[PDB]
Amino acid sequence: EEKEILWNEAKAFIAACYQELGKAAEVKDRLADIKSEIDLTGSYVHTKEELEHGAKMAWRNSNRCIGRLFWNSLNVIDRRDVRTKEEVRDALFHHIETATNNGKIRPTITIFPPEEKGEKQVEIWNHQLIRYAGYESDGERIGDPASCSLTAACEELGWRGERTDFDLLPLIFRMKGDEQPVWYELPRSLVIEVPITHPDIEAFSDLELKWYGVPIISDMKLEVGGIHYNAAPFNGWYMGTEIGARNLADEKRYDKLKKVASVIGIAADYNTDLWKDQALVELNKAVLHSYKKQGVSIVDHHTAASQFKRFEEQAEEAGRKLTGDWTWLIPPISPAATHIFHRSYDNSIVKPNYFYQDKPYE
Amino acid sequence: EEKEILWNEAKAFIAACYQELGKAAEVKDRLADIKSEIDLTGSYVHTKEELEHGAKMAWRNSNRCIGRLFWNSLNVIDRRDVRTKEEVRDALFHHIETATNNGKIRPTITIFPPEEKGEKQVEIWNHQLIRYAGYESDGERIGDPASCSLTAACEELGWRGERTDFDLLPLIFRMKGDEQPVWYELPRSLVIEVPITHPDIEAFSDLELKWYGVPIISDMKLEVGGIHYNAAPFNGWYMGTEIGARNLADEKRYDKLKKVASVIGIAADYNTDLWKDQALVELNKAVLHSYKKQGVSIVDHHTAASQFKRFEEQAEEAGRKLTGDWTWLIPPISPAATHIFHRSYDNSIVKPNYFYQDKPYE
Ligand code: HEM
Ligand code: HEM
Ligand SMILES: N=C(Nc1cccc(COC[C@@H](CN)OCc2cccc(/N=C(/N)c3cccs3)c2)c1)c1cccs1
Ligand SMILES: N=C(Nc1cccc(COC[C@@H](CN)OCc2cccc(/N=C(/N)c3cccs3)c2)c1)c1cccs1
Ligand SMILES: C[C@H](O)[C@H](O)[C@H]1CNc2nc(N)[nH]c(=O)c2N1
Ligand SMILES: C[C@H](O)[C@H](O)[C@H]1CNc2nc(N)[nH]c(=O)c2N1
Ligand SMILES: [Cl-]
Ligand SMILES: [Cl-]
């Protein structure tokens, strides 16, 4: 059954991929080679063209992503050649540097060796390559609560956080054959952070908020033609609401709305005053302003939905079925001000795609 | 098949209804009577208790409604006795008066004779008993675009609107046996309207916005135990976002955000300024303020979600399955500031319930 799933997925992917690449005539001979390779080795190896286009197709198929207009300009870095933890670390350091690109963010994915017998070659523990630690003990909450369990796991491995609200977690990953992951501190010169200030309200800096420039998701599995790339960190740029309406706002994250209300000079006493809504708008204006001022890429939710509409039109004109998750595509502020809110989307799963996988800790 | 559907639906409803009413022992004899009645007449007649509780269950089962905490205090008016259009008109006038209750809105439903052979006894054309007309011709848009087709149909029946932005549509309904509906102008003394002003920004009244106090949905079918009450207008009070984030804001409704931006003194030039979001917040603060100032019931989305959470807890403690439509329950502004956004809901259809039915015009 193993190899059968593999061969069926391989067939569908190659045919589709080669169609899109105008390599339709080469499908027959390539599939034959693959059939042998699977027969003899239990798996097959993607060409650089297949791997690159596969990762792009996977992005294009991500139902929850509003940023898909730009799927075809994804920068694919092939690191299937890595064998050592020093090589993995340096590849992750490099991904951060080249994706950051001095603020002009380049959507990038680095692809490590794939699973074999469902056996991982490289196992990344980080949720994102750059993320803040979280601590909770005896009433005392510090940092990002979403990072509490990973932070606790790192502190089992000999690492110790400073316990500021913005400790950078180290890279943490395990190699096949090793019982424990290794950890490496991020060189701070590689990490761009943005202090949050407001265009009009000088007091806003009293909150001493900041966020990191580049979200690099490092815990999802990229699946291409039956091959499971469990280690394939990718990044785009932020949509501002992710930071302003969720990471800094959620009660189970940084929970800053009451403090925002105070510094913008409004009462946080009555639901009917819509103080949370107003705080959310000003915090979100501040985030966009700050990223712009710092020269770091970011998109607002209005422009992002406008781009997503173009992606819908592109799919229709290319004759491709469009899939999407309405519940994730709508932005968490003013969703009815976007076209997304007013239509529906088929949430069918199409491969290649990115998938959740079980955490190696907890 | 007709009567079979009826008998099966009747059985399920009576058993459930009588359970809830502690009338469990009376189920057997009541179902026997019903079986005879269906056998002989092709239908059955609800007791006043059944009808009242049925309408309440139908509200409780409305997946899209955030206001369901209060399902058991619904005021049910039984007008199955009506036979003439004067009686229907006076019943609708009365519903408006008693539901309005001088501003202290009473959730009410008036129930007219049900369908027979799928044959309507009373056919209501209005979407809501109180609603503004809409006109569109030669570039010129006036009033509420959502009312354009009904307005056009009324003007086929001898009625003529003043063509202000807030013309009250007349009541319009058809009696069984009549080929055309009749129309009646609403007595203005019955209709409370609220001028929209802002608590802090005096210029806001320059927009000359207003809305009506009581939304009374008059085009949905109430289904109870296999009986189809196609004419059963109901009302609650508004959640403020319905007026501020949708009726006055949508581009295909009153489309007021650019004018809001201007009167609150902000530019409407850059997406990154979040001017639409800020305009939405101030317009929504204004709506809540104005309804409160006028002594007309309204709820903000934060309080409404807080009430809905209690409804969820009530269902769990009563041992009832909770059903809901996440896509409708989330408010159209700051949805992630409500608990609703962060959980999921089973969207299964449970009866009794309210259902869409085909419009009698267009
Ligand atoms: C170019 C800039 C991009 C923007 C602005 C963007 C925007 C977003 C946003 C706002 C989300 C929702 C995240 C959340 O609410 O937590 C999302 C989800 C997602 N994006 Fe994108 N994205 C971009 C690029 C990419 C790239 C380069 C990939 C992969 C190659 C990708 C794949 C995904 C996936 C898989 C999800 C779903 C995550 C999940 O289910 O947990 N996106 N995107
Ligand atoms: C007591 C105050 C009430 C509030 C604040 C409330 C709130 C709401 C809101 C905000 C919606 C969504 C409407 C939209 O977006 O267009 C809704 C939908 C609904 N409500 Fe309620 N509601 C209330 C009372 C009632 C009552 C009394 C009934 C019936 C007896 C009812 C039945 C429904 C139904 C059927 C829908 C769905 C309409 C559709 O699918 O088009 N609600 N409610
Ligand atoms: N939900 C489960 N697991 C799970 C638990 C907690 C968290 C998560 C994953 O969180 C998804 C989101 C958080 N909203 O992750 C952040 C994210 C994902 C994708 C894009 C994001 N933003 C961006 N702009 C980008 C990053 C990289 C490229 S673009 C940001 C998953 C399950 C439980 C049981 C079965 S599945
Ligand atoms: N959608 C269809 N029909 C359709 C077309 C246009 C409009 C509609 C119905 O609109 C539903 C909404 C508009 N958002 O109606 C307003 C509404 C409904 C329910 C509650 C509302 N607000 C309230 N607070 C209340 C009113 C009465 C009691 S509470 C307000 C239905 C279909 C097309 C094909 C199959 S179904
Ligand atoms: C397509 C989508 O279902 C549609 O825009 C819905 C979204 N959620 C909604 N929710 C409410 N309360 N009212 C609405 O009219 C809508 N519109
Ligand atoms: C339960 C619900 O699906 C959950 O709260 C979702 C809603 N939509 C979302 N949409 C985005 N973009 N990100 C999220 O984390 C969530 N959370
Ligand atoms: Cl994030
Ligand atoms: Cl309405």
Question: Domain ranges in chain B?
Answer: 1-80+107-117+221-235+305-329, 81-106+121-192+356-360, 193-215+238-303
B237 is catalytic: yes
Residues from chain A contacting residue B333 (CB–CB below 8 Å): 277, 333-334, 336
Nearest CA in chain B to A240: B272
For ligand 1, what atom is nearest to the CA of residue A332? Answer: 15
d(CA A226, CA A7): 7
Q: Give which of A19, A29, A81 is closest to A50, Cα–Cα.
A: A19
Dihedral in degrees, nearest 10, Cα atoms B84, B85, B88, B94: -120
- Amino acid (one-letter) located at A216: I
| Contact between B285 and A273 using a beta-carbon 8 Å cutoff | yes
d(CA A98, CA A74): 13
Q: Give which of A361, A241, A214 is closest to A299, Cα–Cα.
A: A241
What are A122's two structure tokens? 């490289």
Q: Which CATH superfamily is domain A1-80+107-117+221-235+305-329 in?
A: Nitric Oxide Synthase; Chain A, domain 1 (3.90.340.10)
B242 is catalytic: yes
Pairing of strands B140-143, B171-175: unpaired
3-state SS track over B232-254: CCEECCEEHHHHHHHHCCCCCCC
Q: Which fold has domain B193-215+238-303?
A: 3.90.1230
Give A352's DSSP letter. S
Q: Give which of B209, B277, B216, B202 is closest to B243, Cα–Cα.
A: B209
Cα B5–Cα B6–Cα B12 angle in degrees, nearest 5: 90
CATH code at A81-106+121-192+356-360: 3.90.440.10
Residues A194, A296: contact at Cβ < 8 Å? yes
Length of chain B: 362
What are B178's two structure tokens? 């009549």
Catalytic residue among B242, B253, B312, B326: B242
Give A245's DSSP letter. I
> Which residue in B282, B288, B333 has the most chain A C-beta atoms within 10 A of its own C-beta, making it the best mutation to test that interface?
B333
Instruction: Classify each residue of A281-312 as buried b or exposed e, where b means 16 or more C-beta atoms within 10 Å of its C-beta.
Output: bbbbbbbbbbbbeeebbbbbbbebbeebeebb
Nearest CA in chain A to B198: A273
Residues tagged in the binding site annotation of B for heme:
65
A17 assigned binding-site residue? no
Pairing of strands B75-78, B108-111: parallel
d(CA A191, CA A99): 11
Looking from the CA of B127 toward its CB, the CA atoms found within 13 Å total: 14
Residues from chain A contacting residue B271 (CB–CB below 8 Å): 300, 302-303, 306
Q: Is A303 within 8 Å of chain B by CB?
A: yes
The sign of the torsion formed by the CA atoms of B332, B335, B340, B345 equals positive
Q: How was this structure determined?
A: X-ray
Q: Which residues have a C–N gap over 2.5 Å right after them in chain B? A: none
| Contact between B337 and A292 using a beta-carbon 8 Å cutoff | no
d(CA A44, CA B234): 64
What are A119's two structure tokens? 């056996």
Q: What is the resolution of this structure in A?
A: 1.8
What are B245's two structure tokens? 């984030």
